[PDB]
């Protein structure tokens, strides 16, 4: 419901915080919905503690939201996100690359295809090089060329890869005039160091606030339809404290407090990318049995013949005068159990 949105948001912020620990004072950029979607999809085929660990790690309490409701919730979410929207490109889909010799349950396959935007491909993982290339170029195509080389290394014993992809392209409700963009303006990257970036500039009415508790400025920039960007600008030295406070509760607070008024606004034009090896992180967060010799994916294949081995994510962002283009992909790799 809006219950799910609250849970998924808090998962995003907790995972975000894990990243600030693994790569401190560095660019962070990921798609929470992509990561959550891949794991939920994996959970559809899992049983018992293997299944429950995955959803609990995603933030859910199975007393509050039974397994079945979580499944239906995520199927509804991905359907809604993919629903045609004028002036907005947003697609999120998944692909299952199944080994030639695996015995996937027709139930699992029919379910993910009908209910979870899944394309299924029979894959010859005995040519591990060609398989890696096939999967990479499919993710590349589905992300409109924006996510290149998702998979760097694929284990020779790989017998299944689950991939989720997201592509987003939208125009600002109020685009910037490139004739007002300063070619070269300073951006502070640490206390004593600046980099030069093009700085877009406009004066318009925007929803905004100063959080008096957190000492950050929050700025909402709408896209032309069904979407928005939130920029959170901490006071000097206050990034750590703002990061600690990010939560669904904090977003709900801001939603009430944001007020539309005139702002003389300067936003950088830039592109960034980020990659994450997620195997160890997901284990630490509580996904354990999925990796073990006693992994229970009895809902996926006839012979419960696999276990999770690797996971990784790549995401890219561009912001310019016209709008924003962002893409991401998540993969989970399985080997014989
Ligand atoms: N106020 C305008 C603009 C706005 C939309 C969203 I989406 C949002 O982000 C969240 C995220 C979660 I999770 C919530 O529970 C809530 I409430 C808002 C915020 I901040 C502001 C609107 O409503 O369209």
- Domain locations in the chain as residue ranges: 1-172+269-337, 173-268
Residue 317: phi and psi, rounded to 5, are -140, 135
Q: Which atom of ligand 1 is the closest one to the Cα of 254? A: 20
Q: What is the structure's resolution, reported in angstroms to one decimal?
A: 2.0
Residue 278 CA to residue 274 CA, distance in Å, equals: 13
Q: CATH number of the domain at 173-268, please?
A: 2.30.39.10
Instruction: Count each helix (H run) and each strand (E run) in the chain, helices first.
Output: 9, 11
Residues 242-246: contacts with CB under 8 Å, at least 24 apart? 242/214, 242/215, 242/216, 243/16, 243/17, 243/20, 244/17, 245/214, 246/13, 246/16, 246/17
Check the annotation: does 304 bind a ligand.
no
If you take atom 15 of ligand 1, which residue's CA is the nearest one?
Answer: 252
The token pair that represents 129 in the structure block = 């090089």
If you take atom 22 of ligand 1, which residue's CA is the nearest one?
Answer: 255
If you take atom 4 of ligand 1, which residue's CA is the nearest one?
Answer: 255
CB burial of residue 18 (10 Å; 0-12, 13-18, 19+): middle
- Ligand 1 centre distance from Cα of residue 2 (Å): 11
Task: Return the CATH fold of 1-172+269-337.
Answer: Antithrombin; Chain I, domain 2 (3.30.497)
228 lines ligand 1 (CB under 6 A): yes
- Ligand 1 centre distance from Cα of residue 189 (Å): 29
- Strands 88-99 vs 118-123: parallel, antiparallel or unpaired: parallel
- Ligand 1 centre distance from Cα of residue 253 (Å): 9
Q: How far apart are the first and last CA of the chain?
A: 36
Which experimental technique did the depositors report for determining this structure? X-ray
- Ligand 1 centre distance from Cα of residue 61 (Å): 23
**Percent helix, percent strand, percent coil in the chain, to nearest 5:** 35, 35, 30
Which residues does a gap of C–N over 2.5 Å follow in the chain? none
9 lines ligand 1 (CB under 6 A): yes
């Amino acid at each position: 419901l809006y219950k799910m949105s609250s849970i998924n948001a808090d998962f995003a912020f907790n995972l975000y915080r894990r990243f600030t620990v693994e790569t401190p004072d560095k660019n962070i950029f990921f798609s929470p919905v992509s990561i959550s979607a891949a794991l939920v999809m994996l959970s559809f085929g899992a049983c018992c503690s293997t299944q429950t660990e995955i959803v609990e790690t995603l933030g859910f309490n199975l007393t509050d939201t039974p397994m079945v409701e979580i499944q239906h919730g995520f199927q509804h979410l991905i359907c809604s996100l993919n629903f045609p929207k004028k002036e907005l490109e947003l697609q999120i889909g998944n692909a299952l690359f199944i080994g030639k010799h695996l015995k996937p349950l027709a139930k699992f396959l029919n379910d993910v295809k009908t209910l979870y935007e899944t394309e299924v491909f029979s894959t010859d993982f005995s040519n591990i090089s060609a398989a890696k290339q096939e999967i990479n170029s499919h993710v590349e195509m589905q992300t409109k060329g924006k996510v290149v080389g998702l998979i760097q290394d694929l284990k020779p014993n790989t017998i299944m890869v689950l991939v989720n992809y997201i592509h987003f392209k939208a125009q600002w409700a109020n685009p910037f005039d490139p004739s007002k963009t300063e070619d070269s303006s300073s951006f502070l990257i640490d206390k004593t160091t600046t980099v030069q970036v093009p700085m877009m500039h406009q004066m318009e009415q925007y929803y905004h606030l100063v959080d008096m508790e957190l000492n950050c400025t929050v700025l909402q920039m709408d896209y032309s339809k069904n979407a928005l960007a939130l920029f959170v600008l901490p006071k000097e030295g206050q990034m750590e404290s703002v990061e600690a406070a990010m939560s669904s509760k904090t977003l709900k607070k801001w939603n009430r407090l944001l007020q539309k008024g005139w702002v003389d606004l300067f936003v950088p034009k830039f592109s960034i990318s980020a990659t994450y090896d997620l195997g160890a992180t997901l284990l630490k967060m509580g996904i354990q049995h999925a990796y073990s010799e006693n992994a229970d994916f009895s809902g996926l294949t006839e012979d419960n013949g696999l276990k999770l081995s690797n996971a990784a994510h790549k995401a890219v962002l561009h912001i310019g005068e016209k709008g924003t283009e962002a893409a991401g992909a998540m993969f989970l790799e399985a080997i014989p159990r």
